[PDB]
Design a protein around this ligand. Structure first.
Ligand SMILES: [Zn+2]
Lengths: 97, 137, 76, 142, 38, 57
RNA sequence: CCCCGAAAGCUAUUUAGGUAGCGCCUCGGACGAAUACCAUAGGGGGUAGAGCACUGUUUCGGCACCGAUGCAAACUCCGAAUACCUAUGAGUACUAUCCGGGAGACAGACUGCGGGUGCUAACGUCCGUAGUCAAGAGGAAAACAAUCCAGACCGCCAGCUAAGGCCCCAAAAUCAUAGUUAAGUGGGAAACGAUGUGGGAAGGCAUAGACAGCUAUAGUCGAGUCGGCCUGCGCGGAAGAUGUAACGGG
């Protein structure tokens, strides 16, 4: 409840190198949700929201709610990719919990 | 004057410096660090000068980790010699720098003093740099 | 002056016939310095580790055995 | 020969008068050069002078934008060694306003005998009076 | 007047100003702090 | 079943296989239009020289 | 007068600006689908990248090993895209191959990409690969073999376009809509320096009154104020010899 991330679905036409670069130029961040008893789900997040969430340490230990459309996934942040030079977040891995 | 104790070969090809620094771009020893944002070459004299400046500023109150080591030899022709007649003699040693490469980390000093020391050190380097701090991930 | 400047003539090693091709008995399949490939069914081995066909058929490459060796064979 | 050339004996040179007060120098000079060359007539011929006569009044009131009044330089060279002379727009417009228009229109006219003949049809005067009332020029707003 | 490429404040009585497109530093306390970028 | 291919740029300085693809489609000059069968084999040649042809389906 | 049309490479040479065989050109004869492009299907690899499992090399800890951390043309536990070989197939194309007559050529150049050498110098030098020139005119780039567009059988006072352009020299918009710049930036240049001006995100304090100034924290004063981050376009750093001369000119 403390951390809520608003996301849109990332369809197959929004996957790959070119689509991801277009998204990051549009100031979005691709992310993947995986974990027990279900199939992986690809979503896109807001860079502003992600940076705001990462500024706080309790984000890395609490359970956060990712909402895409009506469905809601309760996940924990699992991995994060950053740009080597600019330190900007580039991709995120979330684990169902 | 950092330099390998032994090398398998004396002279190496020029090569091409391309790509980003995916390895060695995270803070792993200290709490605060300085990392390059532009590619280039770092010589042993430059490394020593930056280390001396940082150590003098921080008055040896903490630990300095140097994460760059110059292991690539660079040759030069004697002077007033024509082209050909073999490769030149080894003159100095460099480390290849890619954007994202962390150069120095500092442990056990206040952040303001560390930033002052890093600002003093950056003026001795041939490329642009930035300051980073340890994060969870 | 330099103390370097020598090299040997090329030896033209390598795979001569690839998988799926048809061969006639005696056709050389692989030229190799060591046994990078080993001889399977209907394939013979020369004194310099050359692999050659001993029957007419179709070349096939595979990996088999407890050591993970690369084999070439001829299917009739 | 179904495309005909204009004949010089049948060319009619009409007279016009133009006020330079508040005009931008280059944007007035382009129109002056166009009408001096005759590009505005359907009988235009590249080797024939078909243009009109243009009288310019209030020549010292012409304007430039930016800092060009102080920065735009006018050079000339006497052919003696080191004989490069230099002035600027502010001094030249106060002293010899006709030279400014002469340079501006000369630079936009063709560089040959026909161009020299073309530029003779421009009369530039500093004040608000001109001596060509006998030619009855019409007011042209450009 | 020091004419240099890098002009900075030296003390609290120094002021950075722009005159006719030139960056200058003027000090109310010490005249030796006067600087012009150039 | 069939599509129309028009050549829009010169082929004089293109790669050898690209010129051969144009010739195998049957195009001969700038502005030439041909009508060919819609098969994967023909579409391969079309897609290889996509940058100097225009296709009408 | 008509048709086709190279090469400046490999190998050897008392050979290196010569020559010979092969590669590349042309002509005659034989033979036709055996050829190529592309699509499917089969196949081997050790490069780009990456990694530390071997060989070397590197930093910091712990007790030669152990844990964190880098590097490699002559390192590899891994490993593409392309390229290369083979088979089948549609469409398109005078394609492949064999036998003979005649040659020329064996000084190359620039540009892009992958490299060695050099100083990540040279219109430098040596390879691989592709284009152009050589042996190729026309239009663009002020003028400019090798860049861009494009391949000139002859004639026309007809039309559409490519690169590139549309104020005048000089053909075509002083066209339309929305913003930015004030430096003639545009129309040469770095580390670095700075309340230049747009845009964006976040933070601190504030009408129980914030900042500056003023009166010896109290006090008049009556709205915003303060300091950083990302980003667009600008400023300084910026000295040479015949004459403005670093938009072709206006
Ligand atoms: Zn001062």
């Amino acid at each position: 409840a403390n951390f809520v991330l608003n996301a849109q679905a990332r369809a197959e036409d929004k996957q790959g190198k070119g689509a991801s670069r277009r998204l990051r130029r549009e100031s979005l961040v691709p992310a993947i949700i995986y974990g027990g008893n279900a199939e992986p789900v690809a979503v896109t997040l807001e860079l502003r929201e992600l940076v705001k969430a990462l500024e706080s340490n309790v984000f890395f230990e609490e359970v956060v709610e990712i909402k895409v459309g009506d469905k809601v996934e309760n996940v924990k942040i699992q991995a994060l990719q950053r740009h080597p030079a600019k330190n900007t977040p580039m991709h995120a891995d979330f684990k169902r919990a | 004057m950092l330099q390998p104790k032994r090398t398998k070969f004396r002279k190496v090809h020029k090569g091409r410096n391309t790509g980003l620094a995916h390895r060695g771009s995270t803070v792993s020893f200290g709490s605060i660090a300085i990392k390059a944002t532009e590619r280039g070459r770092m010589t042993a004299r430059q490394i020593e000068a930056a280390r001396r400046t940082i150590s003098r500023r921080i008055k040896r109150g903490g630990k300095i980790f140097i994460r760059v080591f110059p292991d690539k030899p660079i040759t030069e022709k004697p002077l007033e010699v024509r082209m050909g007649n073999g490769k030149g003699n080894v003159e100095y040693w460099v480390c290849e720098i890619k954007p994202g490469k962390i150069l120095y980390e500092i442990e056990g000093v206040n952040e303001d003093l560390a930033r002052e020391a890093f600002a003093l050190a950056a003026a001795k380097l041939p490329f642009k740099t930035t300051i980073v701090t340890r994060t969870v991930m | 002056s330099t103390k370097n400047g020598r090299d040997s003539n090329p030896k033209m090693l390598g795979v001569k016939v690839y998988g799926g091709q048809t061969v006639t008995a005696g056709n050389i399949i692989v030229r190799q310095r060591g046994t990078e490939f080993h001889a399977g069914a209907n394939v013979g081995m020369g004194r310099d580790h050359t692999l050659f066909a001993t029957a007419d058929g179709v070349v096939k490459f595979e990996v088999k055995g407890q050591f993970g060796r690369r084999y070439v064979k001829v299917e009739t | 020969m179904k495309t005909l050339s204009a004949k010089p004996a049948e060319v009619q040179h009409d007279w016009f008068v133009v006020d330079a007060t508040g005009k931008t120098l280059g944007r007035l000079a382009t129109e002056i050069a166009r009408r001096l060359r005759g590009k505005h007539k359907t009988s235009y011929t590249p080797h024939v002078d078909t243009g009109d006569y243009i009288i310019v009044i209030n020549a010292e009131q012409v304007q430039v934008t930016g800092n060009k009044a102080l920065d735009k330089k006018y050079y000339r060279h006497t052919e003696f060694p080191g004989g490069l002379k230099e002035t600027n727009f502010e001094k030249l417009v106060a002293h010899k306003p006709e030279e400014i228009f002469e340079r501006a229109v000369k630079g936009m006219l063709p560089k040959g005998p026909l161009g020299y003949a073309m530029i003779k049809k421009m009369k530039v005067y500093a004040g608000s009076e001109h001596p060509h009332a006998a030619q009855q020029p019409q007011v042209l707003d450009i | 007047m020091k004419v240099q490429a890098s002009v900075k404040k030296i003390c609290g009585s120094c002021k950075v100003i722009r005159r006719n497109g030139v960056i200058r530093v003027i000090c109310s306390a010490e005249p030796r702090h006067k600087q012009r970028q150039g | 079943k069939t599509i129309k291919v028009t050549q829009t740029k010169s082929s004089s300085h293109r790669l050898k296989n690209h010129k051969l693809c144009l010739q195998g489609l049957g195009l001969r000059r700038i502005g030439h239009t041909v009508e060919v069968q819609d098969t994967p084999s023909n579409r391969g040649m079309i897609n290889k020289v996509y940058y100097m042809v225009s296709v009408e389906e």
